[PDB]
Design a protein around this motif. Sequence first.
Motif, short mmCIF file in Angstrom:
data_model
loop_
_atom_site.label_atom_id
_atom_site.label_comp_id
_atom_site.label_asym_id
_atom_site.label_seq_id
_atom_site.Cartn_x
_atom_site.Cartn_y
_atom_site.Cartn_z
N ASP A 103 48.84 41.48 44.08
CA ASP A 103 49.28 42.11 42.84
C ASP A 103 50.22 41.14 42.14
O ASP A 103 51.34 40.91 42.60
CB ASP A 103 49.97 43.44 43.13
N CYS A 104 49.78 40.60 41.01
CA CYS A 104 50.46 39.45 40.41
C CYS A 104 51.88 39.79 39.99
O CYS A 104 52.79 38.97 40.15
CB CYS A 104 49.66 38.95 39.21
N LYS A 144 45.72 30.53 42.06
CA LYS A 144 44.42 31.04 42.50
C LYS A 144 44.18 30.73 43.98
O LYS A 144 43.10 30.30 44.38
CB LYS A 144 43.29 30.48 41.63
N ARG A 183 47.09 46.66 35.64
CA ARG A 183 47.64 45.52 36.34
C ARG A 183 46.52 44.52 36.61
O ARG A 183 45.33 44.86 36.57
CB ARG A 183 48.31 45.94 37.65
N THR A 184 46.92 43.28 36.88
CA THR A 184 46.00 42.21 37.21
C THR A 184 46.10 41.89 38.69
O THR A 184 47.20 41.80 39.24
CB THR A 184 46.27 40.97 36.35
N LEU A 228 44.33 39.72 42.20
CA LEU A 228 43.52 38.63 42.74
C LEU A 228 42.91 39.12 44.04
O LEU A 228 43.62 39.37 45.01
CB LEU A 228 44.35 37.37 42.95
N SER A 246 53.89 36.47 44.30
CA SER A 246 52.56 36.91 43.90
C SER A 246 52.16 36.30 42.56
O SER A 246 50.98 35.98 42.35
CB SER A 246 52.51 38.43 43.84
N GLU A 247 53.11 36.14 41.65
CA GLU A 247 52.82 35.46 40.39
C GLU A 247 52.42 34.02 40.63
O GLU A 247 51.48 33.51 40.00
CB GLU A 247 54.03 35.54 39.46
N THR A 248 53.10 33.34 41.56
CA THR A 248 52.72 31.98 41.91
C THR A 248 51.32 31.94 42.52
O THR A 248 50.53 31.04 42.20
CB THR A 248 53.74 31.39 42.88
N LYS A 249 51.01 32.89 43.40
CA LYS A 249 49.69 32.94 44.00
C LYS A 249 48.61 33.15 42.95
O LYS A 249 47.55 32.52 43.00
CB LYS A 249 49.63 34.04 45.05
N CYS A 250 48.86 34.04 41.99
CA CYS A 250 47.89 34.29 40.94
C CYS A 250 47.73 33.08 40.03
O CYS A 250 46.63 32.79 39.56
CB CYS A 250 48.29 35.52 40.13
N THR A 251 48.83 32.37 39.77
CA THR A 251 48.75 31.15 38.97
C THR A 251 47.92 30.09 39.67
O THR A 251 47.06 29.45 39.05
CB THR A 251 50.16 30.63 38.68
#
Lengths: 49, 49
Positions: free
Chosen positions: A25-26, A39, A8-9, A11, A32-37
Motif C-alpha cells: 500500500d503505497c 517497483k 488507493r494505489t 503494488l 511503501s512509497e519508496t517500494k512503489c517508486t
Amino acid sequence: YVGYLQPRTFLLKYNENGTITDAVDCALDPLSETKCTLKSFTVEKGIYQ
Amino acid sequence: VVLSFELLHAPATVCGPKKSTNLVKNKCVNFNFNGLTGTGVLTESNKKF
Ligand SMILES: *[C@@H]1O[C@H](CO)[C@@H](O)[C@H](O)[C@H]1NC(C)=O
C-alpha cells in the motif's frame, strides 16, 4: 468485521502460479512509497526521492 | 434511441452475428477471440488460469 474502502494505489505481486502473493500500500508509510517508486518489494540502501 | 456501447475489460456477451471457425495450431493465423483480434501462432498454454 466491517471496514470501508478508500481510493488507493497498490503494488501487487503475481507469482508463477498467477496468484497475488503479496501487496504494498503505497500511501501507508514512506517505505511503501519508496517500494512503489522503485517497483520492487526489496529496497536497497540509499536515498530515494 | 441512443445505443450506448459501454466497453471494458469483461466478457462482452454482446457479439453481433459471426460464425465460428475450427481452431488451428502451430500456424500464423489471424485470430478474433470474442472481440480480441490479432495475428500470431496459437499454442497450448501451460499456465493455470
Ligand atoms: C504452482 O505451480 C507449481 C509448479 O509445479 C506447483 O507445484 C504448485 O502446486 C502450484 N501452486 C498451487 C497453489 O497450486
